[PDB]
Design an enzyme around this catalytic site. Structure first.
Site, PDB file in Angstrom:
ATOM      1  N   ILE A   1      75.872  69.462  14.268  1.00 21.62           N
ATOM      2  CA  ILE A   1      75.325  69.746  12.955  1.00 21.62           C
ATOM      3  C   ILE A   1      75.642  71.181  12.647  1.00 21.62           C
ATOM      4  CG2 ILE A   1      73.222  69.925  11.550  1.00 21.62           C
ATOM      5  CD1 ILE A   1      74.029  67.175  12.438  1.00 21.62           C
TER       6      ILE A   1
ATOM      7  N   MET B   1      77.138  76.082  24.445  1.00 22.50           N
ATOM      8  CA  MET B   1      76.533  76.568  23.230  1.00 22.50           C
ATOM      9  C   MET B   1      75.221  77.276  23.506  1.00 22.50           C
ATOM     10  SD  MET B   1      75.677  74.357  19.789  1.00 22.50           S
ATOM     11  CE  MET B   1      74.345  74.457  19.741  1.00 22.50           C
TER      12      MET B   1
ATOM     13  N   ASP C   1      58.066  66.730  20.344  1.00 22.95           N
ATOM     14  CA  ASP C   1      58.223  68.167  20.707  1.00 22.95           C
ATOM     15  C   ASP C   1      58.622  68.988  19.495  1.00 22.95           C
ATOM     16  OD1 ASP C   1      58.388  70.256  22.610  1.00 22.95           O
ATOM     17  OD2 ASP C   1      60.513  69.957  22.991  1.00 22.95           O
TER      18      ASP C   1
END
Ligand code: ANP
Length: 269
Positions: A169, A98, A205
């Site tokens: 998601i 991805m 982060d």
């Protein structure tokens, strides 16, 4: 050579050799050939020939300078972590990449049990050990996701090696979306940060690259730098998340939120 074809080139002996590296990573970066051999119950000359082939396939790195030793490459530690996932029945087939950055490579994958998922393979006190550090990051992300379940983060399914298996998601990174209600989106992110903080977690982060957004709402991902509330520096790490996300909204949308006051608000709850 895709990770699936690499996986296909591995036999049983190959996996045993890799198990023997993995089980000795904590006391050596380059695991001695003699110990790989003794652990794997494969004779030295045959273990040596396996490791040479794994090195040709960029799965291990072999060193000879001080002694004959081997360790995982990124690809190799990832391949081996995938194997642990497949053997455990949590993943059936790795899929397409991805995306990949300096910190991880994220793949699509399919699980009969958990549906269409992502598997995220992690890369990377004296400030100046690849595998143990990458594995530690993975575990940290998995533990944070477990502690956050029920909030707007992916469901988490497994952790092996440098790999975390989680829910896909369906949403885009905030930084790729022009939201028409930035003030409300920023408040939703900050509320979620307060929820993490009430669960004893600081993201560590937070940015426009790991808030995901859809018309449905937001999600937050990316917990390998997360810390527990009352860890060294936790408060400063929390302030940095709040300040950084607020600053992105200021630059992109000229949202007016005051950083110090937003921090004090989260902290008081
Ligand atoms: N569970 C997920 N569902 C959908 N997309 C994801 C998931 N995990 C990662 N991604 C996508 O893959 C990207 C990289 O994952 P991420 O967890 O942010 O790791 P990172 O790239 O190594 N750190 P960063 O770019 O600072 O956020 C994200 O920004 C998402 O676009």
């Amino acid at each position: 050579m895709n990770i699936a074809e690499l996986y296909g080139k591995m036999g049983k002996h190959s996996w045993r050799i890799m198990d023997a590296i993995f089980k000795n990573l904590w006391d050596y970066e380059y695991v001695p050939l003699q110990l790989i051999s003794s652990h794997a119950r494969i004779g030295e000359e045959k273990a040596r020939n396996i490791l040479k082939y794994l090195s040709d396939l960029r799965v291990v790195q072999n060193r000879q300078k001080d002694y004959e030793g081997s360790t995982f490459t990124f690809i190799g530690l990832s391949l081996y972590s995938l194997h642990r996932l497949v053997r455990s029945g949590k993943v059936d087939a790795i899929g397409k990449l991805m995306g990949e950055g300096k910190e991880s490579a994220v793949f699509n994958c399919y699980s009969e049990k958990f549906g269409e998922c992502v598997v995220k393979f992690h890369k990377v006190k004296v400030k100046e050990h690849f595998s143990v550090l990458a594995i530690r990051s993975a575990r940290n992300e998995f533990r944070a996701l477990q502690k956050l379940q029920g909030l707007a983060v992916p469901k988490v399914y497994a952790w092996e090696g440098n790999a975390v298996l989680m829910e896909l998601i369906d949403a885009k990174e905030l930084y790729r979306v022009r939201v028409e209600n930035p003030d409300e989106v920023l408040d939703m992110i900050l509320e979620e940060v307060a929820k993490f903080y009430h669960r004893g977690i600081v993201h560590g982060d937070l940015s426009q690259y790991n808030v995901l957004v859809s018309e449905e709402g937001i999600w937050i991902i990316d917990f390998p730098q997360s810390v527990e509330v009352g860890e060294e520096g936790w408060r400063e790490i929390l302030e940095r998340d709040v300040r950084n996300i607020i600053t992105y909204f200021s630059r992109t949308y000229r949202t007016e939120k005051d950083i110090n006051s937003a921090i004090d608000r989260i902290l008081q709850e």
